[PDB]
Every structure is written in structure tokens, then in C-alpha cells.
Amino acid sequence: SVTETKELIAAHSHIRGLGVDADTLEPRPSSQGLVGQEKARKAAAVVLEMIKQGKIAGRAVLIAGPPSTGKTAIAMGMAQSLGQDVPFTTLAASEIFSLEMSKTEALTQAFRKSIGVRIKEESEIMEGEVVEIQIDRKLTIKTTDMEAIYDMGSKMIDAMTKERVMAGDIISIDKSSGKITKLGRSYAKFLQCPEGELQKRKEVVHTVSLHEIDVINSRTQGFLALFSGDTGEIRSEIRDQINTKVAEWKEEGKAEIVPGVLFIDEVHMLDIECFSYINRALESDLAPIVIMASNRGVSRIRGTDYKSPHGLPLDFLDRVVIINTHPYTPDELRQILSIRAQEEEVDLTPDALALLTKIGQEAGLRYASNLITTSQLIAAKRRAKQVGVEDVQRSFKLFYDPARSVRFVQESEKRLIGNDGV
Amino acid sequence: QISEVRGNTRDHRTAAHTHIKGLGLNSSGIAEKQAAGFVGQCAAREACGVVVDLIKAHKMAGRGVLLAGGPGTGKTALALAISQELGTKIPFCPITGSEIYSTEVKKTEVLMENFRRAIGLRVRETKDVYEGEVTEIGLKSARGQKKLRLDPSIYEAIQKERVQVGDVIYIETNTGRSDAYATEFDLEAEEYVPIPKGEVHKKKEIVQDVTLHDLDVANARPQDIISMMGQLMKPKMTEITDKLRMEINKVVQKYINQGVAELIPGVLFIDEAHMLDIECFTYLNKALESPIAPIVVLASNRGIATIRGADDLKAAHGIPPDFLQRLLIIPTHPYEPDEIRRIVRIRAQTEGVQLTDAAVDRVAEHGVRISLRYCLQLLAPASILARVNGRTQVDVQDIAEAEELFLDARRSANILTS
Amino acid sequence: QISEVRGNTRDHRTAAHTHIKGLGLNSSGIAEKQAAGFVGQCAAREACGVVVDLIKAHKMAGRGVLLAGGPGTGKTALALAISQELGTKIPFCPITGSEIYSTEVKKTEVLMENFRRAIGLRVRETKDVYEGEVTEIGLKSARGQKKLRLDPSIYEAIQKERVQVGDVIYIETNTGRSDAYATEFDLEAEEYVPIPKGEVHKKKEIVQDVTLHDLDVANARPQDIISMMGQLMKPKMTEITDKLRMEINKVVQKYINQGVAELIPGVLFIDEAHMLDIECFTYLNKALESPIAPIVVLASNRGIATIRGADDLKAAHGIPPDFLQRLLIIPTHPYEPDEIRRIVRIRAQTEGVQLTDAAVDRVAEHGVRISLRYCLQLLAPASILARVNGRTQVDVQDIAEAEELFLDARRSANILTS
Amino acid sequence: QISEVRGNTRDHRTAAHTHIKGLGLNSSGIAEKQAAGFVGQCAAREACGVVVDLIKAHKMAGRGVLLAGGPGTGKTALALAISQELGTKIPFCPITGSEIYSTEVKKTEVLMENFRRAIGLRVRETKDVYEGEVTEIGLKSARGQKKLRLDPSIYEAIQKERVQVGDVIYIETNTGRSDAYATEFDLEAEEYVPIPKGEVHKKKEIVQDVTLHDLDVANARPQDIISMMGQLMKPKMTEITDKLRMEINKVVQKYINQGVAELIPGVLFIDEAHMLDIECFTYLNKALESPIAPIVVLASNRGIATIRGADDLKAAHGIPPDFLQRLLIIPTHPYEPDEIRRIVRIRAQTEGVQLTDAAVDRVAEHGVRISLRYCLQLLAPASILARVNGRTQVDVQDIAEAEELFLDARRSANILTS
């Protein structure tokens, strides 16, 4: 089989939008459900309104702010504001540099992941009520007429578990693309169990990114592809073929091009040539929305001997829309951490949550999130009924954060005891 | 190769200069403040007028223009106006020095491409030709037939070509069996070709203006993908070759020889000139000697910069002496608050968003504080925010919220530092 | 390609950790001081226990481990213990960041090789097959004959293959003329193949544990030279190819599909992580997403180091932020004199050299002064010097003379400065 | 290569023997006058019966039959009857010695072709197979679905093939992604193949009888032109090759090995045997030794003729001694007027034209005077001439006018001599 566009790593399983009033474009806190950052979220919504029949004329969006802030979360929110079945690809800037492929190639794949081709074709979709789901190191679904048990690999399990599907859910599964859609519920949206045949052939909409189309029409990457000498670049012939056929489809009217969102984190890692590529791409009508994130105030423009804010060329800076994010108040931190905790299946004691909030204040959100699971395991080894403050403290004394880490390593050569020493 | 071609211009780069229609100079070459889209900046405009008058008199002997000034000034707009004053449909190719740094493309090849974008071709040819299947000498089309009265001269010029009744033919005024007789038993290879349809006469006037690059991309296909998905089709643009460009040039010179078309060298504008290295300036120096080369207009917002490709050889605007010699430097000044208000008013009336005078003031103060570009950016978000309330008229509160929702570079950087 | 292969492990790198048998943690995951080879360092051990428990629960979602500490601490031993706690015969590939800097080999290819060394394959297959020359259906070997009672099913499955009396055959339980009739006048090409010798029955249990790299080097020959004289055979190791590794992977997945073998991702330990550049961390980042990838354990003795491949971008332990994000940092502490005495006693009892308690003290003071590694090195020379006197029991004088005959790095350097 | 093939038989050569259904012999092998289409000629028929009985008893050890007699006798009909008595659908290939003299084809290759036409293949195979897309183990077709109850044996035989839910499969009783999941983005090469349509079950009985030559011409195309316009398509028949025939033979023996088909050697009849030369008889001699060769029946109307390929070596019927040795010579007699009347009556009742007894007499006298063949030819023209008058019943006057409008060979020749 093949694969549809979503396929949207995803450690932010709590974002359906910007938490913003449809008309007022006004950010309501903790809705959809991303917390705080109302200014930056509203700014994002305005940018998106400036994209729909926009006066923006192909500009990039720069989100800058301190680390452990929802700039990435906001990026995904913007991705969701365009609706599902819309290509969204994330990418750390430093990923552009590797031996596996060239900068041009990596950028090309990254951009072609953000542009989807949407057609109307027939497919064998399933629709039914989920009976059972299992785990390993198999899905049981029935209708009012029949019951069946299917097998599935890592991709399918990931896709279903991402859609928050459990026992009792009425869902739909495309056997061609693997696109799972939760229709509703039969008990504690209340739908009734579908009738007739479980597997029906319907004429559905299929969106598939250009890169995915390239991969499908290429030699399928062998098992243990990462650990073999086999690279990852795509032959120019295949690309030309795909581009030509897509062009013919667009001329005919069979396919419709749907631009998406490309998100480049720590964009300050990119050099001049990369920004040349990105700028040249933004001129094509098929170009997706390019959102970049930055943790640095002022950085060196890589490739040259000049410095600039966030490490962007001045020319590029004059053409971007900047959205700024801010540190979180303790409440927002506690809320975010709790949301992140209930999705990691970790039952926390209020004191443990508060302590984790303080840890989040002093070290950052990512570190606290990292401490959640470790705390869960420490509580598990304890046969603890719940993850108390003791477990969090223990994991905190066991797994250090970067600051305490470099401090501890530097402690091998102390600087004072009675007086400063150097 | 094809004659009539289409041309996709990068209009993303001129979107902020749609109001600029010219330089607004009098008959005596004196700049009129607030005229032809320009507001103030009379000195630079007058200088540009002198430049245009120099080019028109062929006195611009292998020289270029250098626009030195701050980010708030209007160098690009001046270059555009220069292109506009050099005539009608005059090629204008604006780039930045940061664009030549391509991943898998050498700098001077990017420069070469943009030079092709800066050299235009004007085609004005009244082509008259009577085509069809011969029946006598007369001709027939799909629907229509004519009887031409030929002099013995044209008939003795017909004696040369493979002409007989009744084949499909062509006739040049100012300077092959038909399909109707094709049997099913013939197949291919065949000498049968369709009868000219559906006009017995064909007198058209070819009028077009296309750059060399347009001809390059037009003959880069055997659907228009390069214009559809330019950079996104494949890593390396392996379609535009040397043989292609040389064939194109050969064809062009052939068109010129017949007095059919006239190539017109436009304006090549290069921002961030300090970003170019010595080799690029060698190429440009080679270009300045060419009589059929576009006028080169560099720009810079740096006083003294290190010459790239040289051992920390600091110099004026990052320009080598050997090339700076051939440049007429034109200074561009910052703007008084009133000029900024005027410019903002012209922009918002072009976008076009309706805003109060107080909103114009609030934008203008950002035009003074931060660069003009940022305050000019503030327009659309404020319009959206206002339309959200359904105000349909942008007010001070809107510009305020917009300026708080979208900071500039320096504000963002220094706030992030804390 | 061959199934059963041998595997040469670089035991030169684990020679100083032969005493390490595990982490020595209780049922409640609490580290026992002086247990399972480890002495003290309870915090780091408990943390490693949490890591192991995390991997066993598949909660280690694309994350790695970072061991930060001084040269005296035991990061390598901790990684080894981690590999030991993850099960039995679990792959462990220890390297340093300085190893990826090969002369004629790209860094990520060295990384790829070591990743192959860090991904194991457990084969447990009870293979039962009765072979021989058909005589009825019965079979015959060199010495021995049997008469099998076949059901019509197997006989209808025999109808498919080229089976007749009497050819040489094979039989799968759970899931070709013979040599005896070969004449001298036949030569080659021939269909004659030797009779299975010398057992009429062949029921063996295949039990093995080999890395992907073992399979790579096993299929790199058409004598085992690569294992004999690895680097010394030729400048460039041109035997292990891409096609080879892909064929190997294909074969492996084929073995897995039949439920015959199970690949087990081991532990890839990388010392001097600050020595890696951005591209290497890109590769590692790509590896962390792989479900069938070995757990990655970096190590460092540097607080802040410049990120290689970045413009003097100093950072924690020379690790990029994007990759440091996915790491659980575990601190390793220096040792009290008593812990050092204990460790030295464990080592000398493993080497194993007999020494006085005072000698242990004299070594331990060097364990405090200079790194633990140097004092641990002092053992063998002192043993030799003592055995020279035929003392057979190492004393303080021996360790003294040994410490005076073989200085450490800093002593040598600073003495040489004078 | 294809299994089921069509077979175009040269029925132009048996058109005058449609009435011959057998030999008309009793249980004791005695010929019945006027029976099974034959009239008289009891001796030759009884002899042919002995021949058939000899072939059926495998006593015909590398021997053939020689029919010696005049043009009026019925050698061809006897050969046909021999083929008919050898069983049902038994191959019969009648030729003349004059046919091997081809322009651009060697004689023994024509002989080889006709030998292929004389060796048949009987296929009787009850093939049962349940096909479709897997859904459980069950299957689905275009319209129809079934649920088969598989034993663990067949399921362990399924473990071998590339079977998974839900691919398209095949099942052998006595002894691959589906199209429904194919996306538009896949194109080719693909693993998608259409679902078996439109029957979930497929149990058919293959019943056919085709010569080797039929298989040859069936696999000579990559439309059936060779059967459409055989000689008229191109000078040299360059479609039937050696590799083709060897592949065909390989396939045939493969079919035989499975007990699916049985090849049946038919009857190769060769008229004008004296026309063959020594090399042809060498080939035939080589053929007589083959156990799977058709019975060879030569014929001749010449007493003594020169052996072609020999120095005027006159011999019996133009047959070499070495080959005449292996032949059982059967004499065929001329016919009495009454037998001729009977034969004519049988023919005219088969054509079938209605004629008076007096007309039969008038034809019979021509049957005595000239050969039987000529008088038998006289039927149709007389029928046409009568139908012209609309008599619808052929009379003596009609046969008279027909015999005067269409003379025989000798009459024409001797009249032309004058």
C-alpha cells in the first residue's frame, strides 16, 4: 500500500488549532488545547488571515523566543488552522547537513514534503465499531452484519494511537493509504454501528506529498536502510517523471495542488546558500508556508563575516513576518505539564506536579517532560499507587539538566574555597 | 525552436514599488517633490535623470551606477524609475548580492542568468502570408478560398520550390501533398500534411517583448514546469544548457539581421553589492565593456566593508577600486516625518487600505524609529485586525496592536536577549 | 551467503572491565555499594537502572543517554553494565569520538559500521532434516540407512521436486543424481553430487548470536584476512560494500520473517562525544528514530565545548541543542580513597597479582593524585619488577620504582618543560 | 507459451473421402462389401485390418505400409480408414511426394513439418482451482465469495508462497497485491493485479486433441496470419524455428510427465512415393525406429521407377531396397462397373446431388474409360447445368454436356495434338 499526508516527531499530541475565536481572531487560553502565548497566537491567526487571499505575497514567518516555549506548538497550531489533510513537515535546520545527502537535496525533500497532490480516486475503505486492540514488543472491529480481526505494523499502530482510538470507537480505515478517521462512539459524538459490508469501495479524496510520490515510484528502501551504506537522495529521473505527470494532472484537472507548511527549527543553523534556496522557492506559486523558529537573539550569518538578529541575512529579514514568544507564568507551566502528563499515562500527586512546575521554571519544559516518564518508572519500581513527590525528587537527583551537568563537570576544577583562584 | 514565447516576471520583488511610475522630473531635469509616485529625494532623482540622459546619449561609456544609502532610502525604487525612464517595456532585473551564493550553482552563472533576464528583445513584425492548398494560382482553406493574381516574377520564384497543384504552400510578401489526398494505405512515413485551417489568408502583426531568459525557459521543454515549480522540481536545474543558450543567441542575432527584432539592454540592479567577491566583479567588468549589455546599478548600505576574495582589503562599500572607478555614486537620504506620512498615504491608497490620519502618524513614527520598510509592513495586519471588528477603517488602536504583535528585527533580538 | 558465522570482538577495549558483571541493584532498583563488580557510584548506577527499565518498557522513545564526568569516573563500565542488564549476549560497541576521523573513510560510514557492530542477531532454530540417497521411501548415508514411513501428503509434496530413486534429497520437518552412479566418461557439467555423509539423519539445533558486522565480514571473502590483519592488509578497506550490506539485510529480514532469528539492538557507546561534528549528530538523530536501533550512550569529560561544524557555537559538552534535547544526562562522581583502594583490590585480584595492603595504599594515592587509570596501569610493571626479585608478592618499593619508571601524561609534560 | 490451442486441418484433401467412415470389417476381420462407406476392395481392406491389428499389438516393429495400385483405386481412402480404425481423433496427414520439392525449403524439413502434423496430442485434465482475493481462509471474485475450510497441511503449504490477506492466489486440488488496493500514484512497475473475475470457483475439464504442428503455429505469433494467409504472407516461412519446436517438445514432455496428456502417433500418408529421393528415405528410415512415430503409409501407381538420387538405379515403385524391406505391400484393384455405379451413388448422395440411374450409368462408363476421379468430378458441373434449366434432377443430357465441356487430361492432350 501507500501513505496519505498525515503522517504529520509528534510529541505535541494536544494541539488542534490556535485556540482562537473564529471571528474576533481573539486567543482564548487553553483551547484546542494550547496554553497561553495569546499574543503570539493571535499574531499567528492574523498572519494566516493575511495568507487567505493575502497581501503577504510569499513571505516567510519567523517565530523567535526563549527555549521551552510554544513556538513549535504554535507552528503546529498554524498547521492545524489550515485543516487536516494538509501537508505539514517539521525539520531541524542542522538536519540539512549530512553525508547521506546534499543541502540542495535535503531542502528539496523537505519542501516536497510540504506540497501535497490531491486527487479523487476509488479505494477500499473500512467503517466499523472497534472491539479490541492489543500491544506487542491486531485490531478487532465489527459491524451489525460481521466481525473481523486484522493485523497491523508499526506505522498503522502509530496512526491509530495518534487518533486516540480505543475500544468502542466508530472509525474508518483506508486500506490503500492507511488513513484512519474516528467517526464517533457507540457508547461512553454518539453514532450507531454501521451496517452491511465492513469493507466498502468508495470514491474518496487522496492527498499525497510530492516527496511521498517520489518515494512510492522509487526502489523501496530496504530493511535496515539507515545502517547500510545506502543513502536517501532521489534520482532526478524519477523526480522529473513525477513533476511531469503531476503537471499533466493539473492541466487536465485530475489533481489539485495543495500547499502546506514547512517548519525549520533553530533556523540560525542555516547558511547563506540555504536561505538562497528558501528565497528562490518562495517565489514559485506552489510554495508552502515557511515557518522558522529561533532561540537566539543575535547570531552570526553563517557563510559570511557579518552578524544579525537570529542569524538571518538582512535581505531575508526585510521579507519575513516576526512573531515573538515569551516565558511562561507558573500556572501555564503547571497546566502544560499536566496535559503532557495525562498523555504519557502518568498519574501524578499534586505535590509532584507542583515540584515539576518549579523544575520547569528553573530548567525548562523539555526537561520536566523528560522527568515525567522517569518518575513514572521510579514509581513503578516502587509499586507506588501514584507518582508522588518522592519519585520526582529522586529522578531529579538521578538525571541532571544541562546547567547542573556542565556545573558538575566543571566541579573537577573548583575556583574557590576561601578565595577566588585562577 | 519557437518564436512567440511567454514570460514569467518575478513580480514578488516589485510589489512594494507599484506606485513608482517614473522619476517625476521636469523638462529641465529638475525633480518635483511628490510627483510620479516619488516623494522628496530630489537630489538622487535628478542624478538618476542625468544617468538616463547619459545612457540615451551613449556617453555612459562602460560605466555603472552605485546607490549608497540607508535601509530607509529608496534605491530599488530609483533603479525601477531608471528602467522606466529609459523607454517602454524596458527590462528590469532586481537581485541581491546574497542570491549569487547558490548551493549547486556557481555565482557567475547566476549572474549570467540574471543578465539574460536583463537583456530584452522587442519584436515588431507585420507578417503577411497567404496559405492553403493550390488549385490553379489560387488557394483553399478549411472554410474559404481565394484566387491570387501572380506576376511572372513570383511564379519564377515558385519554380524553385516543390510547388504543384495541389500542395500546401506558404508566401512571403514583404520579403508537400495535402491531407485531402491521403489514403489509408499510406501510413508513415508520409508527405501528407493538413490543409491550412481555417483562414485562406493569414496577415498578423507580431508584437512582443521578451528577455533572453524567457527564450531560455521557453526552449527548456520538449508542460511549463520550470515556471510552475521552479526550485521545487529538482535540486539541480539541469535544463538550461550552454548549447541551448548559444542556439538561442544564434536565433536572436538571426532575427536582428532581418530587421525583425531589436534587443534592448535593460537595467540590472544588484543590492548588497558588498556581498560580491572579486571574481564576480571581474565578470561585471567584462560585462561593462559589452555594447549590448544592460546598465548595471549596484547598491549598498555599508560605508566600508572588507573586499570579499581579498586579504581583509577593506574598501568603500565593499567594492574593489578597479570596478569602483567605473561607477557614478549617487547618495540616497533618509526621510523627514512628513515625507514618511506622504509615502505611507500613497502606499495605503495603493494596497489599498483606508486608515485615519492619526493612524498614518502612528505608522510614520515607526517609519522614523525603525526602518520605513517595517512601518510599511504594519499596514496589512492592522487592516485585518480592523476588519475583524468590521471597522473597515484602520485606526490607531489597530496599528498599535499590530506593532505589538509583529516586532521588527532589533526589537525581537534585544527582547530575546532578556 | 553463509548462515553460521564467527565473530571477532574487539576485546582490547573491555580488558579493564572484566570484573564488571552488572549494576548490582536490588529488587527496588537501589544500588548496592560494592556489588556485582561496582564500587560506590550508587547514583549513576541507579540512574542506569532507570534507563534499562525504561528501555524494557519501550518508554525510551527515541532518546539516548549522556554520561558526564571526569576521567577517573566509570562511564564505560556503566555502559557495559547497561548492556549487561538489557539481557544476555546483548551487543556492546564501545568507541571514541576520535575514531570517526579516518583517513580514507567518511565519519558516518565508520558510525554506520559501528552501528552494524551494535545491532545483534539471535538465532535459535531446531532444524530437523533426514538426508541421503533414495532407495525406495528410505535413505542411505555413508554409513547408515533408514526407512521413513511417509504419509501421502509429504509424497504429494515430493511429486513437485525432482525426486526419483535414487537421488540425493532434503526434508523439512517443522515447516539430482548421486555420486555412486557417476561414470568417468561424464566429467562436467554433471548432475552428480556426493551422497550425504556420514549420517542418514541430521537433526541439529542452531544456536548463535552475531552482529550485522560479523555477517558483513563473513561474506567479505570469496581465508579470514580482514580479521587476521585488518588495517594492515591494504590502505582502503574495499571489501565491505553497499550491495553486500543490503544483501545481508535482505537475508536477515528473511530469517526474521520465518520466525527463525530475532535481531536485538544492543548498546552503542561513544566516548569523547564533543569530538563529533553536526553531520554526525544528524546521522545519530536519524538513528534515534529507528525502532530497531541500538541505544545510544554518549560520554564526555568536558563541561562546555565548541560545537564542531558550527561558528564557535560553544555548548554543553560539545553537544548540539537539537540532539542534547533527546538525552538523559547522568553525572558520574570522583572516588574517595577507600573506594579507590577497593577498586584496586578488585583489579589486582582479577589480573591477578598478589600485593600488600600498603602497596594498595601507595597505588590508591596515585589514584587520587593522578587519574584512576594511571594507578590501575601501575599494577603489571610492579608485578614484573617484584617477580624479578622473585618476591611473587608486590610491595611498596615495587610500586614506587614502577611509578618512577613510568610517569603519567602531566608529569612527563611538565618535567619535559624543564 | 499457451496450452489450449486451435488447429486448422487441411480439409481440402479429405473432401472426396467424407463418406469413408471406416474399413467395414467383421469381428473376424473379414471385409464386408458395401459397408462403412467402402465398396468392394475387400482384400486391401482386410490387409489394412491386419495392419491395424498389428499396430495395436505393437508387432509393427519399425515397419510401414506400401499401397500399390492404379489411379482408379482407393489408396488414400484406405489410409484414412486405417487412421480411423486406430482409434478416435487419430491424426492423419496426407501428402504427395511432389510436395517436398519446395522452393526455399529443404525436403526433409517439409517431411519434418508433416511429421509434426502426424503426431497428435490428447489432453484430458480435470483441473480444479479456487481463485480470488484472500479475506481471511476465504476468497472473493467479481461477483461471488466463498469460505474454504483449510486443513493445517494446505496452510503449511501456503506458508511457502507469498500469501497474505489479501492477495490474489491459486489452489491446486488433485496435485501479489490485488487491483482493489492500487492507487493512482503507483503506476508501474507494480505488484497490483486484477481480482479473479467473475467466478470465485474455477473447476473446468480440459479436453482437446492437437498436433505438434498446431502447437508450432500457435506459438508462432507474439492475429493468426499463418492460418489466414499461409503461403501468401511472405516468400519464406521464417516463423517456425528450431528453438520454437524444441521448446514445444520440452513443454509437451512436461505435460506427459504429469500424466496430463498422452501424445498419439497418427498416420502419415505419402502419395507418389517414387518422387522421393534417397535422403528422404534416410530420414524416413530414421523415423521408423522411433517408438513415438506415426505409422508411415507410402503409395504408388508405378511398377518400376528410377530411384531418385541413384545412378539410374531402377527399382520397385521407385523405392530403395533398404527401405522397401521394412514395408508390407498391399495391392489395390480396379473396379467393376457395378462397384463404380455404387461409389458414384454414394458420392452424389453425399455431395449431395440428385440424379437419375441412367445418369449414374453414363458417369460410370466414364469411370471405366477414364479414371474414377474424373467421372466423380463430372458430378457438380452436371448439377449446375441441370439447375440452370431448373430441373433440380441431373439427367443424362447434363452429364453428356458436362463431359463435353470438361475433358480429362488424355483427351485434352491428344485432341490438342491435332
Ligand SMILES: Nc1ncnc2c1ncn2[C@@H]1O[C@H](COP(=O)(O)OP(=O)(O)O)[C@@H](O)[C@H]1O
Ligand atoms: N503555549 C503552549 N501551549 C501548549 N503547549 C505548549 C505551549 N508552550 C509549550 N508547550 C508544550 O511544551 C513543550 C515545549 O516544547 P516546544 O514548544 O516544542 O519548544 P520550542 O518551541 O521552544 O523548541 C512541548 O511539548 C509543547 O507542545
Ligand SMILES: Nc1ncnc2c1ncn2[C@@H]1O[C@H](COP(=O)(O)OP(=O)(O)O)[C@@H](O)[C@H]1O
Ligand atoms: N522617495 C521615495 N518615493 C517613493 N517611494 C519611496 C521613496 N523612498 C522609499 N520609497 C519606498 O520605500 C521602500 C524603500 O526600499 P527599497 O526601494 O526596496 O530599497 P532600499 O531600502 O535598498 O533603498 C520601497 O518600498 C519604496 O517604494
Ligand SMILES: Nc1ncnc2c1ncn2[C@@H]1O[C@H](COP(=O)(O)OP(=O)(O)O)[C@@H](O)[C@H]1O
Ligand atoms: N564504580 C566503579 N566500579 C567498578 N569499576 C570502576 C568504577 N569506576 C571506575 N571503574 C573502573 O575504572 C576505569 C574507569 O574508566 P572507564 O570505565 O574506561 O571510563 P571513563 O574514564 O570515561 O569514565 C575502568 O577501568 C573501570 O572498570
Ligand SMILES: Nc1ncnc2c1ncn2[C@@H]1O[C@H](COP(=O)(O)OP(=O)(O)O)[C@@H](O)[C@H]1O
Ligand atoms: N473401395 C472404395 N470405397 C469407397 N471409395 C472409394 C473406393 N475406391 C476408391 N474410392 C474413392 O475414389 C477415389 C480414389 O482416389 P484416392 O482415394 O484419392 O487415392 P488413389 O487414387 O491414389 O488410390 C477417392 O475419392 C475415394 O473416396
